Design a protein around this ligand. Structure first.
Ligand SMILES: O=C(O)CNC(=O)C(=O)O
Ligand SMILES: [Mg+2]
Ligand code: NI
Ligand SMILES: [Zn+2]
Length: 331
């Protein structure tokens, strides 16, 4: 079996290998990349997402989210407080202000220490989940706005045409902005490109061990767990690497830098944080290997998770027994 220890793999495709997205994902999996839950892809040196980032300041962040923590330094939840709209230019200035800027540090490791020590005592503001793209229309390879849609993949595998569309999202981050432990909707893949700015550190649990994370989470967030049998779908819980190691949870970590892609694999739990002002673009996607995961994906029906229009059809076709209850939680 390839990659039996479930290590995060890093790939360096040539320009020729960068032409066919589906084929390259399948190549990665042939080498066992999916066992880790997350892979890094460094694009060929000839490639670029767009010419420059000099003209992005007028993008609007309609609902910036202040991420307020509760709990202890290594075991906490976060809620999102809505703030007034601001432009990317305004947000970048805020990120760089003395209140929010990245502290002095020696290296990524020192910064990770400082994150886990001090995250809970600050409430950074995240410009997340903004529909849009920063890829130039003329970028033909690994353009996240031109991938094959999940609806077309389900149609090609299963024969049923469904409604829905699939478009990318922009994330403008600052120091300590945080993504809580989650898998993707319907245990989809995701792909994330860091367009500009400071790094993003990721933590991931191998898919074959995801239930171990779920069991620990039920123990560490006992009220949440009573409220919902799939409360990690709420995307609010954080558990530090120190806590995971103490509880024997298998995981890995990696830092993504500007110009690099990350791919998360079906049922690969992941969490992380931003080092300073940055902008990432991400989208979900599917392959034939996803279908079986989609069929088995847990769902939140307590009402909290509230998701896109396009998840309806996935639940309806792949999980017809669940559909009625899940839709009650949507409505
Ligand atoms: O970048 C972030 O805040 C979160 N991204 C993801 O969880 C992803 O790309 O799957
Ligand atoms: Mg602009
Ligand atoms: Ni994700
Ligand atoms: Zn729920």
């Amino acid at each position: 079996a390839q990659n039996p220890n479930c290590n995060i793999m890093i790939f360096h495709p040539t320009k020729e290998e960068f032409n066919d997205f589906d084929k390259y994902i399948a190549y990665m999996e042939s080498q066992g990349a999916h066992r880790a839950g997350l892979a890094k892809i460094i694009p060929p040196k000839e490639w670029k997402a767009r010419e420059t980032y000099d003209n992005i300041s007028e993008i609007l962040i309609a609902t910036p989210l202040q991420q307020v923590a509760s709990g202890r330094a290594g075991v906490f939840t976060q809620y999102h407080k809505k703030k007034k709209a601001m432009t990317v230019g305004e947000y970048r200035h805020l990120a760089n202000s003395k209140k929010y800027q990245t502290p002095p540090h020696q290296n990524f490791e020192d910064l990770e220490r400082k994150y886990w020590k001090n995250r809970i005592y600050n409430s950074p503001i995240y410009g997340a989940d903004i529909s849009g793209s920063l890829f130039d229309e003329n970028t033909k390879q690994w353009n996240l706005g031109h991938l094959g849609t999940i609806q077309d993949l389900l149609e090609k595998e299963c024969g049923v045409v469904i409604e829905g569309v699939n478009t990318p999202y922009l994330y403008f981050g600052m120091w300590k902005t945080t993504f809580a432990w989650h898998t993707e909707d319907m245990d989809l893949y995701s792909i994330n490109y860091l367009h500009l700015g400071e790094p993003k550190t990721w933590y991931v649990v191998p898919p074959e061990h995801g239930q171990r994370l779920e069991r620990l989470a039920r123990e560490l967030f006992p009220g949440s767990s009573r409220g919902c049998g799939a409360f990690l779908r709420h995307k609010v819980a954080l558990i530090s690497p120190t806590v995971l190691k103490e509880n024997g949870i298998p995981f890995n970590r990696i830092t993504q830098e500007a110009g690099e892609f990350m791919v998360t694999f079906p049922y690969g739990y992941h969490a992380g944080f931003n080092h300073g002002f940055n902008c990432a673009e991400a989208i979900n996607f599917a392959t034939p290997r996803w279908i079986d995961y989609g069929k088995m994906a847990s769902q939140c029906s307590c009402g909290e998770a509230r998701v896109t229009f396009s998840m309806d059809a996935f639940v309806r076709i792949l999980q017809p027994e669940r559909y009625d209850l899940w839709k009650r939680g949507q409505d």
